Structures are given as structure tokens and as C-alpha cells.
Design a protein around this ligand. Structure first.
Ligand SMILES: *[C@@H]1O[C@H](CO)[C@@H](O[C@@H]2O[C@H](CO)[C@@H](O)[C@H](O)[C@H]2NC(C)=O)[C@H](O)[C@H]1NC(C)=O
Ligand SMILES: *[C@@H]1O[C@H](CO)[C@@H](O)[C@H](O)[C@H]1NC(C)=O
Ligand SMILES: *[C@@H]1O[C@H](CO)[C@@H](O)[C@H](O)[C@H]1NC(C)=O
Ligand SMILES: *[C@@H]1O[C@H](CO)[C@@H](O)[C@H](O)[C@H]1NC(C)=O
Ligand SMILES: *[C@@H]1O[C@H](CO)[C@@H](O)[C@H](O)[C@H]1NC(C)=O
Ligand SMILES: *[C@@H]1O[C@H](CO)[C@@H](O)[C@H](O)[C@H]1NC(C)=O
Ligand SMILES: *[C@@H]1O[C@H](CO)[C@@H](O)[C@H](O)[C@H]1NC(C)=O
Ligand SMILES: *[C@@H]1O[C@H](CO)[C@@H](O)[C@H](O)[C@H]1NC(C)=O
Ligand SMILES: *[C@@H]1O[C@H](CO)[C@@H](O)[C@H](O)[C@H]1NC(C)=O
Ligand SMILES: *[C@@H]1O[C@H](CO)[C@@H](O)[C@H](O)[C@H]1NC(C)=O
Ligand SMILES: *[C@@H]1O[C@H](CO)[C@@H](O)[C@H](O)[C@H]1NC(C)=O
Ligand SMILES: *[C@@H]1O[C@H](CO)[C@@H](O)[C@H](O)[C@H]1NC(C)=O
Ligand SMILES: *[C@@H]1O[C@H](CO)[C@@H](O)[C@H](O)[C@H]1NC(C)=O
Ligand SMILES: *[C@@H]1O[C@H](CO)[C@@H](O)[C@H](O)[C@H]1NC(C)=O
Ligand SMILES: *[C@@H]1O[C@H](CO)[C@@H](O)[C@H](O)[C@H]1NC(C)=O
Ligand SMILES: *[C@@H]1O[C@H](CO)[C@@H](O)[C@H](O)[C@H]1NC(C)=O
Ligand SMILES: [Ca+2]
Lengths: 493, 493
């Protein structure tokens, strides 16, 4: 029995006391990436994130970076496998770019054969290395023409287009791909893309930001999330009834997870802490389980929250085989019953709560994570436990988990990412405890990311990768950082 | 009387004997640019050239450059006026970006107010500086969603969308803008964008280039050019019936002009030289004057050449008030009746001619222009005379004329662009001769370009501007090259 440390110093970076043997045999220790962050613009059509970044370069990052060239994994895909081979990664999570397979958006307008060859090459390369291909259908890279036609997910037309795109993917790669993920972080797009206007497509209220071409921020996020659920339900419907019969695989969505703590020792904070969990996670888990949003959210939002039809409710309910939970940090929750003017009101205010980084006394829950948050290693223990106890204990994979490091660090400092090692071992340490003590059904962990790449809304100012990628010499060998070496030795027996 | 020199050395760089007084008083000596090459990606939607450059970086230039930032005239628009003020330029030619005023392509989908403020600022700045606003409605920057919906100009739908977009421009800027241009270089888009696949949208035959997503190099160019005439006629139709009554302005198209010489002293070359002029110029000038395609083109192309309807023929005929001629170089023409396989045949081969840089004896017609051609100063004299005699009422504006300089030249070499001075004075020299001797109705000349910018299909490998723009320091002062100083002294007499 090992005592996991919650604050510095950390002894989990020693493989003598912390190794893969602390987890059950067959645990998936892997890495992850996103299509827009690695692939690039070559051989693919323009998507919504291209338009958002090009029109508002600051919104895509302070460095004004974009997903045009990044590390060019579309051309250097073999290099990613080489890094994984050195990492002994048994699995890998990547995204299929909709604007690559369907540059014109719709399947009827044509399919890019070069896209199929590229993805087949990567999948076959993983199979030759005996790596499990975790595939994300949608990673926020919606084709641009779809947004210019029916505003993307704001219209229900996207459900049919997403169905056809998913239907084509199963026919091409379903023979080898067995882990299908529909959408990554369902909560992110309606909140940061349709309420705050900080992500693509950039819709927000005029008072929230004049740069937004338009938006309401009080009705659009609920509409977009409602149509996303219908599209996600339709994709699961197609896969099980046509491809699961022969390919024998599972399909499941991925949710963003955060742990919540009371701001102080008051009952109002305790209710606000519970409300934060319900609104942040139950907003989708409720429909995923009972086919309807939580009653408290339904009461609070009222008519601004749409409702699923009888046909839709059956499809949405139980529309998952596994859950790709992603946990990064823990935040404190407090009560905020302040009435807000309509011009600046956002859907995030409907919970009547305020999320903070520090406690009432200014104490952090853990070591610093980024410029404006701190990571709480025990938070992942709570998140897995919360999902297991609140919902019928499902098959859970840690599809995304990582630590941000400043990009201005030189090669020696970036490779010596001992802080990244501390983040990963500690979170894995509490992950092992919750699997053992609480019997939580967690079988896979994917560190984010495989290598340094473009970060949404931040450009290249920070790095999440386990392997350093000198963007001045992207064709050069991508050496593994000290965190990468530790992860391989952690896997190695 | 000055003896115009056709080859080196050139004595036309002395304003003492060759100045603006050689032209009639009120002659417009100005500069020109295009939206995609100067404006940038900020505050505008994605167009077809964005997709072309992003998907095929090599096709957009060896340097892989694109129109994302270039000289950033959207942010530094005052700098362009300052350079023109230093040049004593009496006029200026610019383009209104369709993806800027209408980022979604269709007028019903919304109008960008920030675009209106930007264009009004430039127009108002020009008026305060006594600058003549020459506006090009379309400079090949078609909105991407329009191409992704109805294949751009390949469909007749483009006529209605272009009509509404042109109508909006007259309503906003027609109070001050009096020189409206519908399309720039009508011949270029069907040939280099739908036959060779070298320009946007990149449609070409599979054998011509596998990189092209698809196209027929023998049928698509004639269809696209047919719809351009319908779109061009519609834009003129709107201006005359609604705005010409009160605004009192002129609207006219712009065509690319080349002079042709026999390859050798044979009759077959002489026949081919006459055919080259008909196919290069008469393809549109014929319908613009007589309402029908040239008879020789109709016989040669046959069914692959479309025909105008009775309603369309009346609208297309006489759908111009002036003609913006652009002349750069002269090419030799020879006969070539070689039958080509259909899979590799291009529409350019329908003339049964071959265009060469040198004649049969290997002699160049003039001093070198670029890496693979030479400029013939007397060619502009022939073009004005040929257009005047073949097409009565020859109201002619020289909308584009310039000399390219290699980008690898350092700051000192680029500023000392005496080769550009030699090109400009000599072409202007023959321009004065044809105005007097041949009595051609030429009133304006626009040198290309105002400053160094992105070059289509070439990136930033070459420079056409009269003022040096250090692209590492785009916000820095844009000093005038020796050609810019000469041009000001040419006017300042
Ligand atoms: C006409 O062209 C000649 C040839 O370039 C110019 O003479 C150059 O002047 C610059 C600056 O005075 C010198 O650096 C060059 O060395 C000169 N050329 C040569 C070959 O020595 C002349 O200044 C130009 N004059 C006008 C009025 O444009
Ligand atoms: C663990 O971290 C400490 C922190 O400085 C470092 O010195 C040590 O080399 C690391 N060991 C391993 C095995 O990662
Ligand atoms: C595991 O990592 C080692 C370290 O380089 C490598 O040699 C080996 O090939 C890897 N094994 C697999 C199956 O990729
Ligand atoms: C959804 O699709 C079609 C597209 O033309 C349109 O008629 C309908 O009004 C759209 N609805 C919304 C809310 O945009
Ligand atoms: C401050 O944080 C600590 C742990 O980080 C927590 O125990 C304490 O309750 C917080 N302060 C208040 C007033 O709740
Ligand atoms: C409570 O909400 C209001 C408006 O939503 C906001 O201005 C205020 O800062 C919030 N309270 C705290 C402590 O952040
Ligand atoms: C959002 O829509 C509602 C419709 O009830 C309206 O009352 C509100 O003013 C809108 N928001 C903004 C910022 O206009
Ligand atoms: C870039 O990487 C390549 C790898 O093959 C190497 O040969 C080259 O020296 C590197 N150049 C620089 C400037 O780091
Ligand atoms: C452990 O590492 C060795 C190389 O040191 C490698 O050959 C072996 O395959 C690794 N173990 C597994 C299970 O891949
Ligand atoms: C002509 O250019 C010169 C630059 O030397 C400038 O000072 C002058 O004001 C200009 N004349 C105009 C714009 O009438
Ligand atoms: C445009 O082309 C498409 C076929 O891909 C179709 O919607 C339509 O028939 C065309 N437009 C018109 C006006 O016919
Ligand atoms: C080729 O051109 C040169 C000058 O440009 C001329 O002297 C020569 O006679 C020409 N030869 C032909 C047309 O065969
Ligand atoms: C004549 O045309 C054919 C096909 O376009 C080409 O292969 C041949 O080189 C041409 N002849 C000359 C002399 O260029
Ligand atoms: C182009 O179209 C013609 C007739 O429509 C056909 O004969 C030819 O094969 C086509 N070219 C290609 C490359 O398909
Ligand atoms: C950029 O240009 C400005 C003005 O020309 C100048 O003051 C500055 O020193 C330049 N900086 C660099 C790094 O070239
Ligand atoms: C010559 O330059 C001066 C500079 O102020 C300018 O005012 C004038 O308009 C220019 N043209 C003539 C013909 O003087
Ligand atoms: Ca770009």
C-alpha cells in the first residue's frame, strides 16, 4: 500500500514504488491528440475553427497561432507512432477531421480519397504496433460551409449531416477501429462557443463581446447542446444497428469533468457545490440516463431549456456503451443569487452559482496547474467515485488528462518537465486507489497530449505533450521529455 | 517628340523629356491592388483562395505563403493612402472582398458592419486626398460556402448572388465611388482555375494534376466564362437602372490583354497569330460587342461552347461603359494541329495554336520580364490600337501594368528597381504614342502594384509593388522604391 501525496513533494515519480503493477493487468496506458491540433490544413477543407481563428487571431491565442501547420502530423504521422512505440503506448486517441473526409461538408458533394488513405495508414500502423485505436468523431472541427448554411448545430439539419459523416467512417475504418467516440467535451461548445463566444463559431451576446457576429448566450447554448445530443444519439443508433453486428465494437461519448468543493463551511455553499455538479455534469448525464434534463435545471432554465420528443427521448436515453471521462482540475463552488441584466446574462449564470479557483481564505486545493488554477490530485478520485455512485457504474476510460507547461521554456527546461511527472503520477495514484477501494470501473488512461501541439484558444503558448516538438524544426526528431521517459518506465515491467 | 525605346538601355527615366505632360491633362496616374493580396484574414470570412492555399500550399507559392496576413491593409489601410499621397497618385484601384462584406456569401445571411466601416474609411480617406476611387467588385475571392454549395461560377446560381452583392456595394459606397469594375481578367479564371487547375478553386482534369479535386479541362472553362458574362451583365444592369440616374458614374469590366506575334515568317504562323488574338480577347469582347461568341471559336469548340439566350444576348451586348485593359507581356504564336487525348486535353488547346516566349529563331521580343518570359513595350501600343479598331468607341483604362522583381533581393536591390522604371517608362511611352497617333480613348493608367504583396500562385517569391514592404516588419514604414520616386517626379511637373 502506497500513500499518495496531495502536495509537494511527490514520490510517485519513482518507478520502484509506483509502477503499472499498481493497476490491474490490461490497463490502457496511452496518449491522445486532436485532429485540428496535429493534422493541419493540407489535403482538407476549411472548418469553423479556421474561420474563427483567421477572423479573430487573438481569440485563437495570444501568439496568433492556428491549426494550419502545427506539427504537421498529416504528413509526419509515422513520427507519432514512433513516439508511441518508444512510450509503449497500448492505445491512442485521435480525431477524424470532418473537413478532411468531407471538405464540402455533405457526403453527397464528394469524399476525399486521400483522407481515407491517410487514416487507414495511421490505423494500420497502430495495428502493426498492436495499439488500440480510440477514434473521436467530432473534435469541434465542423466544416465551415455547414455553419455558413444552417449555423451548424443551431439548426437540426446538422443531425442528418453528422449521421452521414459517421456512417461513412464506420464503413471505411470500422473493420479495425473498435473504440468510437462521438464528441469530445460536449459541455465546452455551447458554453465557450455559443455563450461566452470564446470558441468557435464565436456566437455571443452583443454586450458580452462586440466582436461576435451575433448571438444570444441565453438560448443558443441550450439549443446547440440539444441538437448535439440528437446527432450523438443518431450516430450511436447507426453504429449499433449496422456495424456493431459484425465489427463487434463499442461507441460512447466523452464528457469534460471537474471536481467541486464548497467555498466555505456554509449550507448555501453546500447546495451551491451540489448544484455545480448537477449543472456541469448532469446537464448531459441526465438525458443520457433518463432521457431528460435534471429537474432543477428544467425548473431554473424553464422555457429556455428545450425538451426531447418521445422518439428522441428513447434514442437519447442509454445512448452510450462506455464513458471517456476527462478530468484536469478542481474548483471551489459558491452561491451567487445576483440578478443579472438580460444584455449581459449568459446561460452559465442559470445555476445561480459562482466557480472559483481558491477557497474562502485564499488557500489553493493543490499545486499550481496553470496561470489561473491549481490541480487537486484527489479530485480524480472523487470524479470516478462520483460517476460510479451517481450513475450505474459504467465502463470508464480516462481519455484526457494532462498538465500545461509554458511554451517559452527552452529545450532543456521543457524536456525536464518534472512538474508534469508530478501531475501525472499523483493523479494516477489516486486513480488506482478509487479503482481498488471503491471498485470503480476504470480501465484506460490517456495522457494529453502525445506531443506539443496547438492548444485551442491559447495557440502555442502552452504545451501538454509528453514529447517536445521544436516547431522551428517540425521535421526533426521529436525527442521524449522526462515525463515521457517516466511513463514508459512506468509501463515497462 | 520622344523616340520610344524597346530594349536596353532606356532613357525614359528622365522626366525632363518624358513626363505626364505627354498625356492629356486630367490623365489618371494611379496604382492598384486586390483584396486577397493586401487585406488579410481579420474581420472577413473564408474565400475560395483561402481553401486553395490551405489545401495546396505549394500551389499558392514555393514559399507556401497565403493571404492571411500579407501586408495587412485591413489594419494598415492609412499606410496605403500615405504611400499614394507621397506618390502624387491621382487615382487608386482596389477590390471589395465578398467574404468581408458578406462573410456568409449570401446577402440574406447577414452583412458585416465592420466591413462597411473599413471600406468607407478608405473611400473617405481617398476623397479627402483627391483620389479617384476605382472599385473592382470581384477579384476571384469568391466566398467558400458559395463554392461548396453550387460549385461557384460553375452554376448559374452565382449570377443572382453576385447581383445582390454588387447591388449592396452601390448602395453603400456609390455616393463617392464612380468607377465600378465587375470582374478582373475574365480569361484567367476559366483557364487557370477550371482548365489548368493552377488557381482557385483548383478544378482540372485528373490527368492534368491528381491534386485537383476534380474537373473537366475541356467543358468546365466555357461554362464558367459563360456565367461570368451573365453575372457581369447583371451587375451593369443594376447600376444603370437604379444608380446611374443620380450617382453619375461608369461601370466596366476588366480583361487581361496580351499581344501576339508570328512564330516565324510563314503564313501558317500568321493565321495562328490571328487566331490567338480571337481566342484570348474575342472570347468575351465578341459577346460584349455583338452579343455572340466569335464564329471561329463557335466552329472550333462546337457544342463545348455554350450560346447566349435571346434575353441574355441583349443584356450582355453593350454591357459596359469603359474597358479596363491589363497588359504585361507579348507572346509568339505558332500553328499546332496536334490531336491530344481527351483525358489530358485542355480548353486552351482549342485554338490549335502554341504560345511561346521566343520565336522560331530563338530571339526574345524584349528585355526579360520574369524567369520565363520577356516584355515587349510596343505590345501595349498594338493592344490599344487593336482594341480601338476592332471595337468601336474604345473607352480604355489601363487598370494593371507592372514589372515583377525577385523577392530574394535585399532591401538595397529591391529599392533600386531601375528595371521596374525601365518597364514603366517604356510602356507609358508607347501608351502616349497610341493615344496621339492612333487616337485611342485611353484616359487612365494604373501601375501594379502599390506595394509588395502576395502574388497568386507564387506567394511572396516576387514583388510587383512600387514601394518596399518588409514583411517581417509590416507595421514599419513602407519606403518608396526608385520606381516610386520616379513616378512621383513623372507626375510632379
Ligand atoms: C536613371 O537611371 C540611371 C541608371 O540606374 C540612374 O543612375 C543611377 O543612380 C543611382 C543613384 O543616383 C546610382 O546608385 C546608380 O549607380 C546609377 N546608375 C549607374 C548605372 O551608375 C539615374 O539616377 C536615373 N535617373 C532618373 C531621373 O531616374
Ligand atoms: C523525481 O523527481 C525529482 C525531482 O527533482 C528528480 O530529481 C528525480 O530525478 C525524479 N526521478 C524520477 C525517476 O523521475
Ligand atoms: C516498448 O518500448 C521499447 C523502448 O524503446 C521499444 O524498444 C519496444 O519496441 C516497445 N515495444 C512495443 C511493442 O512497441
Ligand atoms: C434549418 O434549415 C433550413 C435551411 O434552409 C431552413 O429552412 C430552416 O429555417 C433552418 N432553421 C433554422 C432555425 O435555422
Ligand atoms: C481553505 O482551503 C482548505 C483546504 O484547501 C479547506 O479545508 C478550508 O475549508 C478552506 N477555507 C474555508 C473557509 O472553507
Ligand atoms: C456574482 O455574479 C455577478 C453577476 O453574475 C458578478 O458580477 C459577481 O462578481 C459574482 N460574484 C462573485 C463573488 O464573483
Ligand atoms: C435573447 O433572446 C431573448 C428572447 O426572449 C431576448 O429577450 C433577449 O433580449 C435576447 N438577448 C439579447 C442580448 O438581445
Ligand atoms: C533540424 O532537424 C534535422 C533532423 O534531420 C537536422 O538534421 C537539422 O540539423 C536540424 N536543424 C536545426 C537548425 O536544428
Ligand atoms: C519493456 O521495455 C523493453 C525495452 O527495454 C521492451 O523490449 C519491452 O517490449 C517492454 N515491455 C512491453 C510489455 O512492451
Ligand atoms: C506629392 O508627394 C510629395 C512627397 O514628396 C508630398 O510631399 C506632396 O504633398 C504630394 N502632393 C500631393 C499629394 O498633392
Ligand atoms: C447547382 O448545382 C446543384 C447540383 O450540384 C443543384 O443544386 C442545382 O441544380 C444547381 N443550380 C441551379 C440553379 O440549377
Ligand atoms: C525573331 O525575332 C527577332 C527580333 O525579336 C527578329 O529579328 C527575327 O527576324 C525573328 N525571327 C523570326 C520571326 O523567324
Ligand atoms: C503542340 O501541342 C502538343 C499538345 O498540346 C504539345 O505536346 C506539343 O509540344 C506542341 N508543339 C510545340 C512545338 O510546342
Ligand atoms: C469531359 O467531358 C467530355 C464530354 O462531356 C468527355 O468526353 C470527357 O471524357 C470528359 N473528360 C474527363 C477527364 O472526364
Ligand atoms: C520596424 O520599422 C519601424 C519603422 O520603420 C522601425 O522604427 C523599427 O526599428 C523596425 N523594427 C525592426 C525590428 O525592424
Ligand atoms: C506637385 O507636387 C506638389 C507638392 O505639394 C503638389 O501640391 C502638386 O499638386 C503636384 N503637381 C503639380 C502639377 O504641381
Ligand atoms: Ca491560414
Amino acid at each position: 500500500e502506497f500513500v499518495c501525496e496531495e502536495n509537494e513533494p511527490f514520490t510517485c515519480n519513482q518507478t520502484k514504488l509506483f509502477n503499472s503493477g499498481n493497476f490491474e493487468k490490461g490497463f490502457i496506458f496511452g496518449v491522445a491528440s486532436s485532429a485540428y491540433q496535429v493534422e493541419g490544413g493540407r489535403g482538407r477543407g476549411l472548418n469553423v475553427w479556421d474561420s474563427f481563428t483567421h477572423r479573430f487571431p487573438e481569440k485563437g491565442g495570444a501568439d496568433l497561432g492556428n491549426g494550419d501547420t502545427t506539427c504537421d502530423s498529416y504528413t509526419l504521422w509515422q513520427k507519432d507512432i514512433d513516439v508511441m512505440d518508444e512510450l509503449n503506448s497500448t492505445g491512442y486517441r485521435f480525431s477524424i477531421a470532418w473537413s478532411r473526409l468531407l471538405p464540402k461538408g455533405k457526403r453527397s458533394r464528394g469524399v476525399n480519397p486521400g483522407a481515407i488513405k491517410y487514416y487507414n495508414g495511421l490505423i494500420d500502423g497502430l495495428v502493426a504496433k498492436n495499439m488500440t485505436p480510440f477514434v473521436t468523431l467530432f473534435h469541434w472541427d465542423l466544416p465551415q460551409t455547414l455553419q455558413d448554411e444552417y449555423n451548424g448545430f443551431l439548426n437540426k439539419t446538422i443531425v442528418d449531416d453528422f449521421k452521414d459523416y459517421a456512417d461513412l467512417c464506420f464503413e471505411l475504418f470500422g473493420d479495425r477501429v473498435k473504440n468510437w467516440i462521438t464528441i469530445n467535451q460536449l459541455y465546452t461548445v455551447p458554453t465557450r462557443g455559443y455563450a461566452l463566444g470564446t470558441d468557435a463559431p464565436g456566437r455571443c451576446s452583443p454586450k458580452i463581446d462586440v466582436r461576435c457576429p451575433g448571438g444570444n448566450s441565453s438560448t443558443e447554448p441550450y439549443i446547440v447542446a440539444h441538437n448535439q445530443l440528437l446527432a450523438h444519439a443518431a450516430a450511436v443508433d447507426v453504429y449499433r444497428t449496422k456495424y456493431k453486428d459484425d465489427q463487434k465494437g463499442m461507441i460512447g461519448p466523452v464528457m469534460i469533468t471537474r471536481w467541486f468543493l464548497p467555498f466555505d463551511h456554509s449550507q448555501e455553499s453546500k447546495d451551491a457545490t451540489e448544484r455545480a455538479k448537477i449543472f456541469f455534469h448532469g446537464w448531459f448525464m441526465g438525458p443520457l440516463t433518463e432521457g431528460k434534463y435534471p429537474d432543477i435545471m428544467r425548473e431554473y432554465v424553464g422555457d429556455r431549456l428545450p425538451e426531447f420528443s418521445e422518439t428522441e427521448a428513447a434514442l437519447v436515453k442509454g445512448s452510450y456503451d462506455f464513458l471517456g471521462l476527462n478530468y484536469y482540475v478542481t474548483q471551489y463552488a459558491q452561491n451567487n443569487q445576483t440578478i443579472v441584466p438580460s444584455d449581459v446574462h449568459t446561460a452559465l449564470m442559470d445555476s445561480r452559482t459562482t466557480l472559483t479557483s481558491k477557497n474562502a481564505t485564499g488557500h489553493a486545493p493543490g499545486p499550481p496547474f496553470n496561470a489561473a488554477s491549481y490541480y487537486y490530485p484527489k479530485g480524480i478520485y472523487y470524479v470516478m467515485d462520483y460517476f460510479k455512485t451517481t450513475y450505474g457504474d459504467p465502463l470508464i476510460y480516462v481519455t484526457e488528462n494532462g498538465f500545461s507547461t509554458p511554451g517559452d521554456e527552452d529545450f532543456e527546461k521543457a524536456t525536464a518537465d518534472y512538474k508534469r511527472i508530478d501531475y501525472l503520477c499523483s493523479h494516477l495514484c489516486f486513480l488506482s486507489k478509487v479503482i481498488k477501494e471503491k471498485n470503480v470501473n476504470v480501465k484506460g488512461y490517456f495522457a494529453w497530449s502525445l506531443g506539443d501541439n496547438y492548444e485551442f484558444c491559447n495557440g502555442f503558448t502552452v504545451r501538454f505533450g509528453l514529447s517536445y516538438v521544436d516547431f522551428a524544426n517540425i521535421t526533426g526528431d521529436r525527442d521524449l521529455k522526462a515525463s515521457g521517459k517516466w511513463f514508459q518506465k512506468f509501463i515497462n515491467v
